[PDB]
Structure 1
Amino acid sequence: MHEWALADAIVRTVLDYAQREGASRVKAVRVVLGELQDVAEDIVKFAMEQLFAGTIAEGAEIEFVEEEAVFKCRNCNYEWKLKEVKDKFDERIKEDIHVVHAFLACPKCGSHDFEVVKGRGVYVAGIKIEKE
């Protein structure tokens, strides 16, 4: 596992703060992840939520945010973002004479005529409210 060590840190970081703050409960925790992380966020929630159990961090809304990736060159000082790199690479996959018919046709038969079972949908999967 690569998502536990990630929750042990983030769960120790959160309980170290609340403790040195004399808090009665941790309500929310925002986490930022570099777009370079190959981890699955829901496993981290699984792990976090589980590690908070029986602590003042129980029932703490957990949000995740991505931290765009960027790097700098010491020798030229040219600073750049990941994206630039992807296109420079993608256009060397274009020299491979690569692909279109594959993304536009059912893999089983030649097809090329289909239906969108799940795709362009937009509903409200859930609402959290308060009553009396």
Structure 2
Amino acid sequence: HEWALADAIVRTVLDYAQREGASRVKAVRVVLGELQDVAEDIVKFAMEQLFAGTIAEGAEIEFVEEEAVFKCRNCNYEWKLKEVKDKFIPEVVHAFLACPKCGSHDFEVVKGRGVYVAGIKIEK
């Protein structure tokens, strides 16, 4: 969910600011995996609302999308989601997607599953 994820982001950012003894936070850059089905606008808005009434208020939030990369183990071949997209895409791939080369369905997600904060701007 958008609001839950946004809550996680806000909590983490505020925690980092507390640890660093930050007087104020001004900018946060978050990297979202495209396998997340969340909508960037809702998440950003939610973050803005939760950011109210704290040191990290009125902060500028930037979202960077990390492409999804899959590595089939059997043939040992890597491909990207964009290659399969050309024919919602994100959720629960394991069900439908397989390697373009193998009849396998067995693969590991290397990039694009997780969400992490890549940058934080602190004012002390």
TM-score > 0.5 by shorter chain: yes
C-alpha distance after superposition, 1:26-80 (max 9, x if no partner): 1100011122222221111221111111111001000001101111112221011
TM-score between both structures, scaled by the size of structure 2? 0.66
Rounded to whole Å, the distance in 2 between the matches of 1:126 and 1:3 is 20
CA spacing shift, 1:129–1:23, aligned 2, 3 Å = closer
Higher relative contact order (CA 8 A, sep 6+): 2
d(CA) in 2 for partners of 1:85, 1:17: 38
Quote the Cα distance in structure 1 between the aligned partners of 2:24 and 2:63: 20
TM-score w.r.t. the length of structure 1 is 0.62
Please give the alpha-carbon distance, in whole angstroms, between the structure 2 residues aligned to 1:101 and 1:127.
34
Which sits farther off after the overlay, 49-58 or 31-40?
A: 31-40
**CA radius of gyration, larger in:** 1
Change (3 A) 1:84 1:55: same
Given the superposition, is the C-alpha separation of residues 115 and 63 from structure 1 closer, same or farther in structure 2, using an over 3 Å criterion?
A: closer
Q: Which runs of 5+ in 1 are unaligned?
A: 90-97
C-alpha RMSD of matched pairs (Å) = 14.7
Closer, same or farther in 2 for the Cα pair 1:24/1:119, shift >3 Å?
Answer: closer
Question: Which 5+ residue runs of structure 2 have no aligned equivalent?
Answer: none
Alpha-carbon displacement from aligned partner over 1:71-97 (angstroms, at most 9, x marks no partner): 1112221011112222369xxxxxxxx
Separation in structure 2 between the aligned mates of residue 106 and residue 71 of structure 1, nearest angstrom: 8
- Sequence identity (%): 99
When residues 75 and 67 of structure 1 are mapped into structure 2, their CA distance, relative to the original with a 3 A threshold, is: same
Tell me, what secondary structure is at the counterpart of 1:72? Answer: strand
Question: 4+ residue stretches of structure 1 with deviation over 6 A?
Answer: 98-131
